[PDB]
Amino acid sequence: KRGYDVTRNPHLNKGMAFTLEERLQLGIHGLIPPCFLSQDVQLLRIMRYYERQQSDLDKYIILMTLQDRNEKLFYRVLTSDVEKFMPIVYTPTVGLACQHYGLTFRRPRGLFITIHDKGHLATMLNSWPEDNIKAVVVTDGERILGLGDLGCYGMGIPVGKLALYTACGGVNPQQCLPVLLDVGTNNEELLRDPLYIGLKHQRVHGKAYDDLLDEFMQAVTDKFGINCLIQFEDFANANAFRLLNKYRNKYCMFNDDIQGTASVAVAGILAALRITKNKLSNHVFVFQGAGEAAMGIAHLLVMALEKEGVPKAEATRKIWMVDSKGLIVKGRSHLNHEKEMFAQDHPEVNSLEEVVRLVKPTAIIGVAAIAGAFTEQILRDMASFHERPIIFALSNPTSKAECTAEKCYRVTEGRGIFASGSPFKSVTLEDGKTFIPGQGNNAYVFPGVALGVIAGGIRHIPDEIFLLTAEQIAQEVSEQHLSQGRLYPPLSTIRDVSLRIAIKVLDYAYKHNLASYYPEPKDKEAFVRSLVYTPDYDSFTLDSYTWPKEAMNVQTVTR
Amino acid sequence: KRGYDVTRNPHLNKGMAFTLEERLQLGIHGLIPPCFLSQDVQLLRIMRYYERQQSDLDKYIILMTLQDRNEKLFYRVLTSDVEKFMPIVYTPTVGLACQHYGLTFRRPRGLFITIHDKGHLATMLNSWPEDNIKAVVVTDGERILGLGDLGCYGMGIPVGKLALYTACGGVNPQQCLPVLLDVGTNNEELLRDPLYIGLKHQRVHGKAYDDLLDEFMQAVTDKFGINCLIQFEDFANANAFRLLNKYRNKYCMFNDDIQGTASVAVAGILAALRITKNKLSNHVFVFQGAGEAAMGIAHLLVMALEKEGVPKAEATRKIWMVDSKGLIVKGRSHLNHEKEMFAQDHPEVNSLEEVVRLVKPTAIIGVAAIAGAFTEQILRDMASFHERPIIFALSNPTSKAECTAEKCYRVTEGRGIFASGSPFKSVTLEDGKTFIPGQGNNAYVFPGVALGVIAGGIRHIPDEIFLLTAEQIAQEVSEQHLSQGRLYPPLSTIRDVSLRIAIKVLDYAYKHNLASYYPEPKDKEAFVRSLVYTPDYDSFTLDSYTWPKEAMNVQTVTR
Amino acid sequence: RGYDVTRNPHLNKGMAFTLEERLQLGIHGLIPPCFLSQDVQLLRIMRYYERQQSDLDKYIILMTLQDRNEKLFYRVLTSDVEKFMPIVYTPTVGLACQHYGLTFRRPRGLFITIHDKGHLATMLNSWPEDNIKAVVVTDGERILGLGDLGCYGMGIPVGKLALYTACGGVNPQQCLPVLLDVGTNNEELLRDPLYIGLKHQRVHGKAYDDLLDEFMQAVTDKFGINCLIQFEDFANANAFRLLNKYRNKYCMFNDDIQGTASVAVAGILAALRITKNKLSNHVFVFQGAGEAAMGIAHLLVMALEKEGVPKAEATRKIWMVDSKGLIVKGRSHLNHEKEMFAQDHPEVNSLEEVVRLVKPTAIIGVAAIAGAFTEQILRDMASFHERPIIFALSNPTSKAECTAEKCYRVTEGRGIFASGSPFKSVTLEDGKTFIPGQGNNAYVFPGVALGVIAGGIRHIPDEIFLLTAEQIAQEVSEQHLSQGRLYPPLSTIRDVSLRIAIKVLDYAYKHNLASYYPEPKDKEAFVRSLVYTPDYDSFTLDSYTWPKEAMNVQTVTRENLY
Numbered sequence A, B: 001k002r003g004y005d006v007t008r009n010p011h012l013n014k015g016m017a018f019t020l021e022e023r024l025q026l027g028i029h030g031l032i033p034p035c036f037l038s039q040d041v042q043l044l045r046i047m048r049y050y051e052r053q054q055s056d057l058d059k060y061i062i063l064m065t066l067q068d069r070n071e072k073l074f075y076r077v078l079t080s081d082v083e084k085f086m087p088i089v090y091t092p093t094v095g096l097a098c099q100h101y102g103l104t105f106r107r108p109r110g111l112f113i114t115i116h117d118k119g120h121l122a123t124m125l126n127s128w129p130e131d132n133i134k135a136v137v138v139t140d141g142e143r144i145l146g147l148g149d150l151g152c153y154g155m156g157i158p159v160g161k162l163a164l165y166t167a168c169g170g171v172n173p174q175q176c177l178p179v180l181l182d183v184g185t186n187n188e189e190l191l192r193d194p195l196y197i198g199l200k201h202q203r204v205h206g207k208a209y210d211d212l213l214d215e216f217m218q219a220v221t222d223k224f225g226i227n228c229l230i231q232f233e234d235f236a237n238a239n240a241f242r243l244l245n246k247y248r249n250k251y252c253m254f255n256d257d258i259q260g261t262a263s264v265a266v267a268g269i270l271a272a273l274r275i276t277k278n279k280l281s282n283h284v285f286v287f288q289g290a291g292e293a294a295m296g297i298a299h300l301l302v303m304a305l306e307k308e309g310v311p312k313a314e315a316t317r318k319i320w321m322v323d324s325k326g327l328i329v330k331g332r333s334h335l336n337h338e339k340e341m342f343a344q345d346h347p348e349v350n351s352l353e354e355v356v357r358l359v360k361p362t363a364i365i366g367v368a369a370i371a372g373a374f375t376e377q378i379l380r381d382m383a384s385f386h387e388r389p390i391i392f393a394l395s396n397p398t399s400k401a402e403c404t405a406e407k408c409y410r411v412t413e414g415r416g417i418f419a420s421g422s423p424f425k426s427v428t429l430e431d432g433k434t435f436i437p438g439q440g441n442n443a444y445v446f447p448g449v450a451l452g453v454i455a456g457g458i459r460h461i462p463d464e465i466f467l468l469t470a471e472q473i474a475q476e477v478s479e480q481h482l483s484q485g486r487l488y489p490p491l492s493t494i495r496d497v498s499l500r501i502a503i504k505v506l507d508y509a510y511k512h513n514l515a516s517y518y519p520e521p522k523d524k525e526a527f528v529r530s531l532v533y534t535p536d537y538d539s540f541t542l543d544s545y546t547w548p549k550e551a552m553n554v555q556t557v558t559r
Numbered sequence C: 001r002g003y004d005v006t007r008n009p010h011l012n013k014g015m016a017f018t019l020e021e022r023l024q025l026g027i028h029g030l031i032p033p034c035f036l037s038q039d040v041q042l043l044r045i046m047r048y049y050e051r052q053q054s055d056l057d058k059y060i061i062l063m064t065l066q067d068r069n070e071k072l073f074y075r076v077l078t079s080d081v082e083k084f085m086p087i088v089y090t091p092t093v094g095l096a097c098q099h100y101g102l103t104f105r106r107p108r109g110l111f112i113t114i115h116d117k118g119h120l121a122t123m124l125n126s127w128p129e130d131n132i133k134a135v136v137v138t139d140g141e142r143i144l145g146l147g148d149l150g151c152y153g154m155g156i157p158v159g160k161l162a163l164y165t166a167c168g169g170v171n172p173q174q175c176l177p178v179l180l181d182v183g184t185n186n187e188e189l190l191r192d193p194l195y196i197g198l199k200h201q202r203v204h205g206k207a208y209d210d211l212l213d214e215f216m217q218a219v220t221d222k223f224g225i226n227c228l229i230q231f232e233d234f235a236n237a238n239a240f241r242l243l244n245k246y247r248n249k250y251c252m253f254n255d256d257i258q259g260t261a262s263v264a265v266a267g268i269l270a271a272l273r274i275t276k277n278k279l280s281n282h283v284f285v286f287q288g289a290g291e292a293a294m295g296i297a298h299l300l301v302m303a304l305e306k307e308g309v310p311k312a313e314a315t316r317k318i319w320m321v322d323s324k325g326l327i328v329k330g331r332s333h334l335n336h337e338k339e340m341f342a343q344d345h346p347e348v349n350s351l352e353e354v355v356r357l358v359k360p361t362a363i364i365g366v367a368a369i370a371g372a373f374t375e376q377i378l379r380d381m382a383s384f385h386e387r388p389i390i391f392a393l394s395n396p397t398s399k400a401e402c403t404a405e406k407c408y409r410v411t412e413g414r415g416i417f418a419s420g421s422p423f424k425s426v427t428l429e430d431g432k433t434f435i436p437g438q439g440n441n442a443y444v445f446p447g448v449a450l451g452v453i454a455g456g457i458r459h460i461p462d463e464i465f466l467l468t469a470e471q472i473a474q475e476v477s478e479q480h481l482s483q484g485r486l487y488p489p490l491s492t493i494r495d496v497s498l499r500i501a502i503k504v505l506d507y508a509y510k511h512n513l514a515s516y517y518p519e520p521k522d523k524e525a526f527v528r529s530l531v532y533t534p535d536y537d538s539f540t541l542d543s544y545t546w547p548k549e550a551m552n553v554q555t556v557t558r559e560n561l562y
């Protein structure tokens, strides 16, 4: 683009980083103050107004205003300290910010598609001004991680999710499109809220809902190609699994709340095997919770056990799940399709504490959002059954964790191998022993998986890709970090980890003939590197050249 | 315009006030949340976030963000209570906001032209995306009313000034262009400020400066027409008068700090004549100060005295001016071109207090920014020389006023006729007498003058136009308001007052053959009304029609 | 910028785009790999032009050239304005559209129909140019020499506007041709399957007048009250009524009435330099009493009054003959403007008898009757006065009152001749040679348009047409007059038009009709700077740097921040 419109284009606007030469060539000289700053100075300037804010919500506001006007500077900020800003642009801040302030974007960020637009979605896609779309993150806003049904305010979550695609993975932000599907909201606070900007009726459900999702997938892939990545985020439990089984083999589709969760949890389990010095086959798993996360983790664990050599039926029997009505056993009431797959041949047990005592698991995984469920008795039991028990308190936020890092290290007398979903500072026990517990962040998974899928036009995303991604993450951890109790690589290395994930995934796709991109690159690393988006400003070079003087003399006819 | 770009166009974007029908016709459906609000609801929504701000500066920030995205809603806010928002978008807030925060506009608002762009101004005008420009407000930022040399940060002042053109006058905002001329700054705080975004050298002066202003006037009128209104704002004293005498007869040009100040001050004097029941010829004026304001007021007073019948030389001798070195008398040192015009035949007098006693003025006008200069002795002297003395404490801000309204009413025992430049709440003396002092706001003048000039293509703005504007303002005051000590009409009536000013001015121009617009309208009020900009959203009607059925049958050829 | 410049005829230079301009505009690869001068382009197109051997075929090639490269189109036209004026305008344009319809492959103007009433402002927005300063409008009812061509009449404003630019230097991009289609009365068009206009008869009455009223209002609302609107080829009654209704309300004139009058009077004033007598010593007989006659006669009275003759005495010098005979007081079949020139005289039915009684010093044929200037009429003139004036203005050549040869032969070399149609040089049997001039309207309207547009003259009073006539009459050299030439050479039309623009501009500021300000001190330097040239424009980017030290202080990095 040229002229005034370039300053309103978030992908090309440099603000005062436009050189005088660039302003003149673009025909915008005089629209910008008479000062010429480097990007590094722009970073310093914006960071001063960043620290003056008294809340995380206000810092999210500042960053959204910056993303509105200068996308290159926005990702300069995010990548300068990814671990610091990830909790601001995404969870847990984005949900709290949208729940309190609504949507604060002053430039349209994506598409709002309602159930009442059924039959006209193709036309609505045409309102988005980018034609080269390769990744779509979509939500209906029914299960925002930690806050529930936010309805139309849930648009902030795909916006924040995609920011991490780019900041942590190097996915081209211009090829990304966040979509909000508004079928209504069941949040009584929103339906009586006079400032609510979504559909003020209860959620449409049943086939009429599925019809809209069907048209959405068809419309997106009709306009952008069947290779378009479509990631589902923050869908309720029943819809999440149904939609995944329906589309995962027909479209380029995955659900991060199920599959990304599974891979990073399995990654922590594999890293802990390097400490326990046993095989995955030697383990017995008890799940505190039996929803989206627990089902995803359990299914990927079985897939990993199968690769070690354990047949599927045998591997399934190593998994015990406790839901809100007790242990899931054959013949219990209140079971469903997913739950019957893991129903053990056992009498009814009501309490998690009793299940720990009966089955004596080598690892317990908490994904039920019940605070303190890993009691002192449970931790002490686990530390007496096995030398190095594995304690995953994955529920979010921190106030809903199954236990604290300090309580696990103290009660297990420093032998528990711990990981959480929420960040815990380093623990040092009375005896001097020091532990640095790791956080199982989904951003370890979905940025690199998306980069390799987009890079090679990987047509579908089978669960083998999430398994090999977990194996890759597990081997990122160094021996020193294992010595400290860290089961995950540092977040400051996330762009390197994602790039190595993208190459492994790309290599896997070509070997299974799943990649669409042609021809297959010989140097997969160089290929993926060439697609990584950098916060560095591009240059508006002109590409002027001349012809040989003799050729120009002969080709120019005068009198 | 159509498509995505309409949401980024501040003059067409309605936000959620776009009907579903409008979104579909524009091809933007899905870019806006699924809610359809009236402008009145938008006003309520934005006013809630307005009241939560703890400072005027933060409220200016909120309004600038709104002007960035929705100009119709912005002027809906301003016109809902003009008296309330005028101090926020313009003085005194705008100067304090820009001095502390810099420039906060996230959409280019005008043109920055530097001394180093000399010879290339025509090209720079082409960066502004509006071709139909009819009004330009320009500053070099050397004398920001109340804060001094703000350099490049002075861009906020023309932006705020033009907002009042539209809010108080109905001038079309899309035809308005604010310009900042950066020749440097002499503000030592800015030159050592690492965040300053202007030219970091002292101000260029002399002919090299005038050369740049010469090219600026030529470039603007070459591109937009010689009828383009060019108002100068916040120029230092020497430059202000020199530039005015140079351009006022060659271009459509005026300086509000000199001429708008003069007309509203003379307006207060004329309104006070309705209380004093004497002629302007019966008055003796003493000026506290002898700068831009005092010279402008004095020159217009002489022009008014001349119209009552007093010859120029005699009328001049009714004006006494005191500067920083005492009374201005023939043969004094430290006089200049303007000051010699009012030099009295009198010995040197050092103090204002002594001048009041010697000459016994009927009216004292304070424009020197010296706090408390109208002492208790001066007020008591004035109240003993004349029955109804006129006390104008015009210096800004309130802390620099020559006296308070309460001190004038108390010391003169309720007989002083008072006006100020800063707002004073109503005074009630011990004896029950109640006074509602008026504020001499320049916005009484420049919005209506600009509307009539723009409406009729008035080629030049002679001082007779500012005189008749003052006579119009004076007669706006009702008898009841005079009974209360109010010398100016209420600010809530400013759009009506400006419209009546615009008609009078337009009528004056056609009678003196100064108007360019052709043909002369018979109903001047209807003509000017048709040019008043309203905050009401326009409609994207399609204008579809058909031909007579028989005509279409005959004009359509098939097989 | 981009591919679209090659489709923009105002910017497209074809193979004259240098490599550097092609790369800069982002069009490299769209044009063959050769770079041509405009002079070479001119030579190539001229070769194609001469291989054609129809005037119609030469019109088509020039139109497709105008379709793609406007600067080159006008370089062709200006290289020999006399050669191409007949091809792009009268008489070829009328015959071209009559036979081929509209050959334009790029939209040239606006078609506004009676059925579009109430939406004319919307249709003006279809024209991609916003800065229009001259509009030529027709309804196609009286195409000069051909009659009612209906919607095929669009070719005439397009050809007319090309002469505004070629002879006058008016900016072509600021001009808009308009066809108002209210139907047609041509029975051959109404029955024609290929006809592209409204296939019903011409709407007349209030609905017609209201459409024209809206057109004037819509054009000036969008383009400004100063926008020149010139009416072309309307029928007689509409032409005069519309002229009287708008000439004081808008910037308006009718070239068939006023431009014709201007160039006819110019020829007469030039002829006074041969006859060496005052205009008040003359008696005029008009063959024809219609659009052209009334225009010329009214301007003749004006020039007689300026010479000082009372108006009633001046009007009495004019005798008019229509299709019923002499226009007397007390005849039947006499209209409005006809009573103004009726004479207290017995009825006379033949032009021959009128000439024998009145013994006029000048006869002017504007009736389109071939051979009306009989040998008897010519022989009578030459015996009544030593140098009689014979103006055979009817077009085309076949409908002229007499040929130049016949005038010079029968008048024994003493007749002063001018025609509307171009007659070649005449050499009589005794050896005497004459070079008869053509009273071309292009002598008048390009210079008047240029002066009016340059000054923002709000209205065009007939004094401007009179002073234009006086200017043209002074242009002719003394040598050319000795050879019978009453008009300057058509090759000088651009210079003549510039000089006319200056006088018109001088007149306008003296009587405060010019709205452009500031008034230019030097009227010619002012108009010169507005003449459009066929020179290709430059694509030079305005690039520059700030002084080194000033730029170093304004460039902030992480090292030099504090």
Ligand SMILES: NC(=O)c1ccc[n+]([C@@H]2O[C@H](COP(=O)([O-])OP(=O)(O)OC[C@H]3O[C@@H](n4cnc5c(N)ncnc54)[C@H](OP(=O)(O)O)[C@@H]3O)[C@@H](O)[C@H]2O)c1
Pocket: A145, A146, A237, A257, A261, A264, A288, A289, A290, A291, A292, A293, A294, A322, A323, A324, A325, A366, A367, A368, A369, A370, A394, A395, A396, A397, A400, A420, A421, A422, A440, A441, A442
């Ligand atoms: N990488 C991460 O850190 C990560 C990722 C994803 C999710 N999580 C967290 O995992 C937790 C659950 O996520 P989700 O998506 O699976 O939610 P979900 O779909 O709603 O599933 C919730 C599960 O918890 C069960 N439950 C509720 N109360 C229980 C109780 N007293 N005892 C045992 N089970 C109980 C529920 O039983 P019923 O089936 O009977 O209702 C249900 O099975 C959340 O806190 C989430 O933040 C963490």
Ligand SMILES: NC(=O)c1ccc[n+]([C@@H]2O[C@H](COP(=O)([O-])OP(=O)(O)OC[C@H]3O[C@@H](n4cnc5c(N)ncnc54)[C@H](OP(=O)(O)O)[C@@H]3O)[C@@H](O)[C@H]2O)c1
Pocket: B145, B146, B237, B257, B261, B264, B288, B289, B290, B291, B292, B293, B294, B322, B323, B324, B325, B366, B367, B368, B369, B370, B394, B395, B396, B397, B400, B420, B421, B422, B440, B441, B442
């Ligand atoms: N409608 C309004 O309310 C309105 C409009 C415009 C301005 N004002 C106010 O008027 C005041 C002056 O404005 P301006 O533009 O004229 O500023 P200015 O151009 O700088 O002139 C200041 C004048 O005050 C004189 N002065 C300074 N100290 C003095 C002292 N002790 N005694 C007497 N005179 C003294 C100065 O004398 P020297 O010449 O010797 O330096 C100078 O003549 C400001 O406060 C301004 O806010 C009000």
Ligand SMILES: NC(=O)c1ccc[n+]([C@@H]2O[C@H](COP(=O)([O-])OP(=O)(O)OC[C@H]3O[C@@H](n4cnc5c(N)ncnc54)[C@H](OP(=O)(O)O)[C@@H]3O)[C@@H](O)[C@H]2O)c1
Pocket: C144, C145, C236, C256, C260, C263, C287, C288, C289, C290, C291, C292, C293, C321, C322, C323, C324, C365, C366, C367, C368, C369, C393, C394, C395, C396, C399, C419, C420, C421, C439, C440, C441
């Ligand atoms: N620059 C030029 O050389 C120039 C410019 C313009 C026009 N012309 C030519 O002037 C001629 C007329 O043009 P126009 O616009 O004036 O057309 P017009 O108004 O429609 O008709 C002109 C007159 O011809 C009269 N007429 C018809 N038959 C006649 C006859 N036997 N005897 C005497 N008069 C007769 C008609 O009389 P009625 O009223 O009774 O019907 C009518 O008044 C055309 O040939 C045109 O080409 C030349």
